[PDB]
Design a protein around this nucleic acid. Structure first.
Ligand code: MG
Length: 437
DNA sequence: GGGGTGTGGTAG
DNA sequence: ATCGCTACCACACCCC
């Protein structure tokens, strides 16, 4: 048990944190892509007609945790039993759940406590531990398999278990549904074999946005092919409003108030006008939804196809620790900030780049929130405070950055005992070049 | 036309 | 117990 004033805390937290793991795995895939395309111009161009194959493991952690489960769980049955992956028994996040679990209304991000109430009497919830290293090995087999198929002109990592795979179509070839259905089936069988039993679903279209919706429609363990040509009312009626890219709970809520609670993308499509939509959720998001409702990608999302090296290139660097934060005095806060800065500078020197602007953000207990929140070591209900600082010269010097970071903390005025969360960010990065005179 | 900062949504 | 990250965009509002 590692307290936040222990020099080992960051290492233990990050080793246990599935969200940290997902972020680092994602950054590593993006750097790997860059280091492999330092010479290629494998880009998509305006002259290219292309098909999108958007691929994603089904209930990834739960599948892998099951395939690699310990002998204590030998008798657990992935097709019969409700299965979650999590650390604990109560206010512990469900990181993944199998489709047995989901059939009872369990969803990712639920606490185990809430999930247990959703089961009928007599049905027991199976809780598997994380298998982080094997999560990564299955991801290697995934990406290895996609490259070996030699059917994609461009392979874009979205995450450890999800990729957007681009196939250029010569106008010498006439596109058909049967041919894309056969590719989908090959991809699914080769990944199933290559990962020793994980399954993927696949959305296939002539736009990124349709391919992502088709993928949602295709789950679980299936595929769906919906081109712009094939759009119909049954397609749009299949999706909730927050299935759209960039529509979360907050945008969802605004769309409902504005348009009298549409219950499907079809309802939204029939009621909206671009004007009122921009007024509801903003000019850029509104245009994006409007484009999305015609099955069309926006200019921003298309850049990943025409310039993936620039899209995937890292523009900032940060850590966020909003769990386990309980400090008694300012001395312990300063030491934790120094540790965070050290960690971040190891990451910064890995990619050979200086930083010109830093930010400290923190979470502070709401004046009326309990000192000890419902979730053990959780941040609870908090107010956010943030402040940034331009560095004179771009630097990687600990003495400069750490001092400024500790200074930033003092400017935000948070008493150490009220602190519940800390983010440390390098907001602008400058390349290091061969001439340093 | 350019530049800025803090806050906050979303993704996956 | 329990591991509530992190990159990126968009906004409201401010300066010249
Ligand atoms: Mg959404």
């Amino acid at each position: 048990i590692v307290a936040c004033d222990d020099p080992d805390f960051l290492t233990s937290y990050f080793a246990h944190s599935r969200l940290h793991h997902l972020s680092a795995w994602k950054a590593n895939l993006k750097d790997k892509f860059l280091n492999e395309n330092i010479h290629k111009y494998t880009k998509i161009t305006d002259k290219d007609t292309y098909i999108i194959f958007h691929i994603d493991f089904d209930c990834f952690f739960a599948t892998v945790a099951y395939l690699c489960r310990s002998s204590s769980f030998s008798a657990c049955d992935f097709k019969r039993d409700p299965i979650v992956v999590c650390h604990g028994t109560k206010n512990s996040d469900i990181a993944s759940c199998n489709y047995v679990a989901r059939s009872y209304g369990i969803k990712n991000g639920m606490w185990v406590s809430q999930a247990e109430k959703m089961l009928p009497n007599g049905i027991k919830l199976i809780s598997l531990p994380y298998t982080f290293e094997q999560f990564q090995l299955k991801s290697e087999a995934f990406y290895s398999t996609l490259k070996r198929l030699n059917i994609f002109n461009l392979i874009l990592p979205i995450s450890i278990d999800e990729a957007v795979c681009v196939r250029i179509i010569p106008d010498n070839i006439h596109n058909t549904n049967t041919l894309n259905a056969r590719l989908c089936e090959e991809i699914r069988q080769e990944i199933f074999q290559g990962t020793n039993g994980c399954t993927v679903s696949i959305g296939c279209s002539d736009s990124l946005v349709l391919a992502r919706l088709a993928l949602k429609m295709a789950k679980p363990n299936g595929y769906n092919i919906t081109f712009k040509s094939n759009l119909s009312e049954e397609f749009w009626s299949s999706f909730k409003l927050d299935d759209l890219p960039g529509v979360g709970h907050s945008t969802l809520s605004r769309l409902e108030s504005t348009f009298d609670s549409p219950h499907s993308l079809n309802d939204l499509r029939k009621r909206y006008t671009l004007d009122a939509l921009k007024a509801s959720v903003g000019s850029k998001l509104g245009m994006k939804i409007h484009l999305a409702l015609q099955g069309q990608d926006d200019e921003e999302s298309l850049k990943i196809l025409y310039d993936p090296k620039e899209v995937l290139q890292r523009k900032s660097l940060s850590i966020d620790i909003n769990w386990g934060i309980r400090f008694k005095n300012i001395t312990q806060v300063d030491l934790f900030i120094e540790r965070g800065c050290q960690y971040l500078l190891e990451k910064l020197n890995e990619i050979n780049k200086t930083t010109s602007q830093i930010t400290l953000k923190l979470m502070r207990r709401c004046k009326d929130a309990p000192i000890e929140p419902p979730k053990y070591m959780g941040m609870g209900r908090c107010d956010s405070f943030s402040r940034s600082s331009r560095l004179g010269i771009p630097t990687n010097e600990f003495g400069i950055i750490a001092t400024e970071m500790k200074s930033l903390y003092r400017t935000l005025g948070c008493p150490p005992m009220e602190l519940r969360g800390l983010a440390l960010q390098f907001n602008k990065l400058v390349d290091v070049g061969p001439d340093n005179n």
